[PDB]
Each structure stands twice: as structure tokens, then as C-alpha cells.
Amino acid sequence: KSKKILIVGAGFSGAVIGRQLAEKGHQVHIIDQRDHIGGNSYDARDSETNVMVHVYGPHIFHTDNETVWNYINKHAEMMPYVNRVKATVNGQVFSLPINLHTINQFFSKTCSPDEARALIAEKGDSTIADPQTFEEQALRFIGKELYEAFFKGYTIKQWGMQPSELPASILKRLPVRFNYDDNYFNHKFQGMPKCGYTQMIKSILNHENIKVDLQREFIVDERTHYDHVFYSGPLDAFYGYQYGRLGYRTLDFKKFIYQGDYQGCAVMNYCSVDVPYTRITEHKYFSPWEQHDGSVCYKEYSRACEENDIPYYPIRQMGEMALLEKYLSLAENETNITFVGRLGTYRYLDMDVTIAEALKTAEVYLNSLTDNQPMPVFTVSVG
């Protein structure tokens, strides 16, 4: 039987789930409260300069998942692109992530890889058995000088808290490299779609069994016209924010135009706490295969997400997790709905992770029709 499907959101989560089910003969209705598709991945051109702007932040595709990589290659031309971030601090410009060039520049040395290991080991504090905090992880592995130059001020700005109050996991992620490789990402596949993510998602949305209505909020009365709802809007918003709002950081993007090359790279971090923006992005450098004389730039400022701001990074401390638990207990009592995505599950997700989870979630719904069982509320562990 051709099931009737409501999908709330036309970002990756919605577009991908809706595409898998269209292909199996289901009638998919995809709604979005915005006047364009794409969700947080939306990009669009600026009038004046013709620069393709990544409107909700630089969106660099990177994955080790060849399945996901092949999927997006059916819907776009993926161009090579290697993210190479610079950082301004202490009247100097550095290479990130921390590598052999950064170390040799910062400490004015000409160390080989093995000499740099010994130098950083000496600066590190190996008397810390298991770093719990962001500060401890930095003091254990990179030492005070590097910590205070590149990490402390940036991290206070980004998070609104002292690094002694943030988890070690945040920094556990970042490569301390003892060679001259300055690719920001380790993933095997990496790039940017030639015509942008909007066009890519438009291709994913281009199927006979998909209708997309824009400028249309979800209304709780609708659910009864559909056999199943996939919801990628905020979990707390779905329940009227009745227990309070899940905490997020948000960003203000302050747009400006320059006639020429404003900074000469896509991403420049400002690691000093005394520079009020976290970074400056110059969007034309995300599309290096194009030429543009004019340039759209963003200064980016991090702040607590208030009622009307777009939620970007989930805070996910005990408070926020306690709040999350209360929304979970209502969710578990639902039937015929599945909460997905960054907003539906209160998790930061990369594009390729979002895509993989959407493929899985469609798969689960297909298998559950074939097994005449019930579709669960979450297809991923969130507790």
C-alpha cells in the first residue's frame, strides 16, 4: 500500500527521508516554514557580487562514509575543496589546526616532527591522569602557552563559559599534528558541490511522489491525515516549549562587502577574547573554481540563543539534558511520529551524519511496513 507521509522540514533530514520513500511508491508531503528549501544548509547568491553565500555558516562536506559520498554525487558535482583555516592572534597569523608549522612559528624553532613531540611533551603536564575539563586537556597535551594563545579566548567567546567549566571532549576532537599537514579535516572524502547545497537538495527533492509546500508551519491537527509523520523541527517547539527552551548558542552574521580579496582565505579565526567576533568568513573562497572581484564577508559573533534567534550549537549540559529528558518522556508516548535531525534530537550533526541517519530512518520505516510492526519515535539513541 501507498502510505501517506508528512515530513516537517526540507533540510537534509526531510529531503533524504522523503526521497527514499517516494522511490517506494509512497505519497510524501514535505512542508517547511521557511520560503526556501535546504534548511541550515541553504546557500544563495548575493545580487551585487554573484558570490554563493553559505547563509547559516560555512558548510564543508566531509565524510569517511562512501555510501553517503556516492549518494550526494548522484545529486551534485562535488568539487575538491580542502579546508585550511588560518588564525590571527598576538600580532601574527598562524596555520590551524595546530601543526608542525604552527609550533615552529609560535616558539620560533626549526624542529623536526620528533623534536616537536619532545618540545610539546616538556610543555605538557603528564601528571594529570584523566583530563575532565577543556582546560585540563589543554594543559595536559599542548601546554599553557598554546592553550592561552589559540584556545582559551576563542573557547570563552564561542561557549560563554570558562574552559575549566567545559568538557575535555570538545578538545579531544582536535588534531595536534606533528607534521606539516594543515587540512582541517581527517576524513577521506571532502569537498563542496559545484552548484551549492540548495541545488543538491532540490535534486534530492525532484521526484514524482514528492510535493513540497513552503511558507507553511506544521499544525498539530494535520497528523490525522497521514499514516506517519517525520519531524525535523525542534523537539521542545513541538511541545509548545512547555517545560522551557533547550539551550543553544546562536551566531550573528554581520555582512559586509569588499571590492577585492578582503582576507585571502575562506576562514580566519580570531583567537583573542579581546576581538569580539570569533571569526571572519570570506565566502567566495568556499568556491575556489569561481572568480569574483567583489566579495561578501561575514564577521561572526557567538551569543546565548534567545527566544527569536536561530539555534545553532546545542549546549548539552546537565540542565539541558534534564530538560531534554522531560521532552523525551512525552515523545515516547507518541504513535505514528518520528523525530529526526539536529533540531528533532538536540544534537549537532554534520551533513554526512544527517544523511546517513535519514537513510537508516527510511530503511527502518520500510522494514517496519514489511514486518507489520510499529515505527519507533527515534531511530537513534538519544537518552
Ligand X SMILES: Cc1cc2nc3c(=O)[nH]c(=O)nc-3n(C[C@H](O)[C@H](O)[C@H](O)COP(=O)(O)OP(=O)(O)OC[C@H]3O[C@@H](n4cnc5c(N)ncnc54)[C@H](O)[C@@H]3O)c2cc1C
Ligand Y SMILES: O=c1ccn([C@@H]2O[C@H](COP(=O)(O)OP(=O)(O)O[C@H]3O[C@H](CO)[C@H](O)[C@H](O)[C@H]3O)[C@@H](O)[C@H]2O)c(=O)[nH]1
Enumerate binding residues for a second copy (CB under 8 A): 80, 82, 84, 86, 88, 91-93, 95, 100-101, 104-105, 108-110, 112-114, 178-182, 260-265, 288
Which residue reads 519531524 in cell numbers? 231
Find how far residue 316's CA is from the centre of its chain.
15
Binding residue for ligand X, selected from 5, 28, 139, 343, defined by CB under 6 A: 343
Q: Which three-class secondary structure string do you get for the chain? A: CCCEEEEECCCHHHHHHHHHHHCCCCEEEEECCCCCCCHHHCEEECCCCCCEEECCCCCCEEECCHHHHHHHHCCCCEEECCCCCEEEECCEEEECCCCHHHHHHHCCCCCCHHHHHHHHHHHCCCCCCCCCEHHHHHHHHCCHHHHHHHHHHHHHHHHCCCHHHCECHHHHCCCCCCCCCCCCCCCCEEEEECCHHHHHHHHHHCCCCEEEECCCCCCHHHHHHCCEEEECCCHHHHCCCCCCCCCEEEEEEEEEEEECCCCCCCEEEECCCCCCCCEEEEHHHHCCCCCCCEEEEEEEEEEECCCCCCCCEECCCHHHHHHHHHHHHHHCCCCCEEECHHHHHCCCCCHHHHHHHHHHHHHHHHHHHHCCCCCCCCCCCCC
Among 28, 30, 31, 324, binds ligand X (CB under 6 A): 31
Q: Is 173 a catalytic residue?
A: yes
- 298 among known catalytic residues: no
Active site residue 177: yes
Select from 21, 30, 39, 146 the one that contacts ligand X (CB under 6 A): 39
Residue 277 falls in the annotated catalytic set: no
Residue 341 touches which of ligand X, a second copy, ligand Y, none (Cβ within 5-8 Å per kind): ligand X
Please select the residue that binds ligand X; options are 5, 26, 40, 72, rule is CB under 6 A: 40
Binding mask 123-142 for ligand X (x = CB under 6 A): --------------------
**Which of 8/359 has CB closer to ligand X?**
8
Asked about 216 being catalytic, the answer comes back as no
Q: Is 339 annotated as a binding residue?
A: no
- Residue 96's binding partner out of ligand Y, a second copy, ligand X, none, with CB under 5 to 8 Å set by partner kind: ligand Y
Burial of 22 (0-12, 13-18, 19+ CB in 10 A): buried
# residues contacting ligand Y (CB under 6 A): 13
Q: Which of 9, 18, 163, 191 is close enough to bind ligand X by CB under 6 A?
A: 9
* C-alpha cell at position 374: 510499529
Contact status, residue 278 vs residue 89, Cβ threshold 8 Å: no
Residues 67-86 that bind ligand X (CB under 6 A): none
CB 297 within 8 A of CB 263: yes
Q: Is 96 in the site for ligand Y (CB under 6 A)?
A: yes
User: Quick one: which of 170, 195, 369, 382 contacts ligand Y (CB under 6 A)?
Assistant: 170
218 is in an annotated binding site: yes
By CB under 6 A, which span of 27-35, 76-84, 125-133, 154-162 interacts with ligand Y?
154-162
* Active-site residue, 316 included: no
Is 269 an interacting residue with respect to ligand Y (CB under 6 A)?
A: yes
Q: Is 208 a catalytic residue?
A: no
- The alpha carbon of residue 304 and the mean position of all alpha carbons in its chain are separated, in whole angstroms, by 17
From 71, 147, 226, 279, the catalytic residue:
279
Catalytic hit among 43, 177, 197, 231: 177
> Which of a second copy, ligand Y, ligand X, none does residue 40 bind to, with CB < 5 to 8 Å depending on kind?
ligand X
The residues assigned a catalytic role are: 173, 177, 249, 279, 300, 348, 350
* Binding-site residue ranges for FAD: 13, 32-33, 40, 59-60, 218, 342, 349-354
Residues binding ligand Y (CB under 6 A): 87, 96, 150-151, 154-155, 158, 170, 174, 269, 271, 348, 350
Residues binding ligand X (CB under 6 A): 8-14, 31-34, 39-41, 56-61, 217-218, 232-233, 312, 341-343, 349-352, 354
